Design a binder for this molecule. Structure first.
Ligand code: BT5
Length: 294
């Protein structure tokens, strides 16, 4: 299916004149095209087509000092890199990529991205193991919607035009620190190409991944620090409400045991969804449970 060494030699998106990095050049290139990577040829020069201008690692570093950045055009998953490199990291160090050969959703699912058309990054984070991470996904989602001026959806979705603008994937590292060690994965659609999807280019055609990435991370980190102090406090619930695309709406709540319906009533102190069902407020925990507008 894929010659990883090719692509990797091609990942600089630069005009290479037919050096061999293989056994079936036309085959693997068409196989790379079948995966979906775009490879244009002009006579004898081959070139991998970034959907957007490649990022510049040195600029991210200086823009995000003292946090350390690992940049890598092609990767399996920026989450995997944080996991495999956890010992060398401090709170807030990041991995950034252009394309993921195995981008992870929740629960075995996949994350799709064309080459260089997303903001894809993961980072290490850590809490006191006594402190609860109830609501963490809400904090991440809100921080991004505050930067991009878009809307959130419980528990972790980023929304423009009621369309999926990106994904958030919090994973727990089995690392022995005396701390709770997270890797936090974020994908934000910028310029793409199942369900309809949103991309930042719709809203601001002059978006630049190079300066939006540090803007996202600076606010994300800030929102997180506020969360270590205040949790899902009443300021948060108000900030949430203002960005909540489903505030006080008639919704369907999809759990493993079926559908329950009602009117959304925001969130409680643990980040649980609050829903007026019949005559009581019922609460739900974000794992797997999904939300839909009636
Ligand atoms: N680019 C996209 N935009 C919107 N929806 C997508 C999409 N690609 C796939 N989907 C659909 O979104 C579903 C998964 O939604 P979930 O809530 O289960 O899973 C997520 O939404 C979290 C995925 C987060 C991606 C970033 S990318 C870098 C860090 N490194 C990783 O590997 N992941 C994080 C997929 O099964 C659907 O096909």
């Amino acid at each position: 299916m894929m010659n990883f060494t090719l692509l990797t030699y091609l990942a600089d998106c630069q005009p290479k004149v037919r050096s061999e990095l293989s056994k079936n050049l036309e085959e693997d290139i068409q196989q790379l095209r079948e995966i979906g990577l775009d490879i244009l040829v002009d006579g004898q020069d081959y070139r991998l087509v970034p959907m957007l201008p490649l990022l510049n690692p040195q600029q991210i570093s200086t823009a995000l000092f003292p946090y350390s950045i690992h940049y890598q055009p092609i990767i399996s998953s920026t989450n995997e890199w944080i996991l495999q490199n956890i010992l060398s990291l401090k709170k807030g160090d990041l991995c950034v990529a252009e394309y993921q050969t195995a981008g992870r959703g929740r629960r075995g699912r996949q994350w799709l991205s064309p080459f260089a058309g997303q903001i894809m990054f993961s980072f290490y984070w850590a809490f006191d193991p006594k402190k609860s991470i109830e609501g963490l996904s809400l904090v991440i989602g809100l921080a991004i919607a505050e930067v991009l001026n878009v809307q959130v959806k419980w528990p972790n979705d980023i929304l423009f035009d009621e369309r999926k603008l990106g994904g958030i994937l919090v994973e727990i590292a089995n690392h022995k620190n005396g701390m709770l060690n997270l890797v936090i994965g974020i994908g934000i659609n910028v310029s793409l190409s199942s369900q309809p999807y949103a991309e930042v280019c719709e809203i601001d055609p002059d978006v630049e991944r190079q300066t939006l990435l540090p803007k996202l991370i600076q606010h994300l980190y800030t929102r997180l620090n506020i969360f270590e102090q205040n949790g899902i406090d009443e300021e948060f619930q108000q900030a949430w409400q203002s960005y909540n695309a489903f505030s006080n709406s008639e919704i369907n709540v999809l759990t493993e045991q079926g559908v329950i319906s009602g009117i959304e009533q925001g969130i409680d102190e643990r980040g649980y969804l609050k829903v007026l069902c019949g005559n009581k407020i019922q609460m739900f925990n974000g794992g797997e449970v999904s939300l839909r507008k009636k």
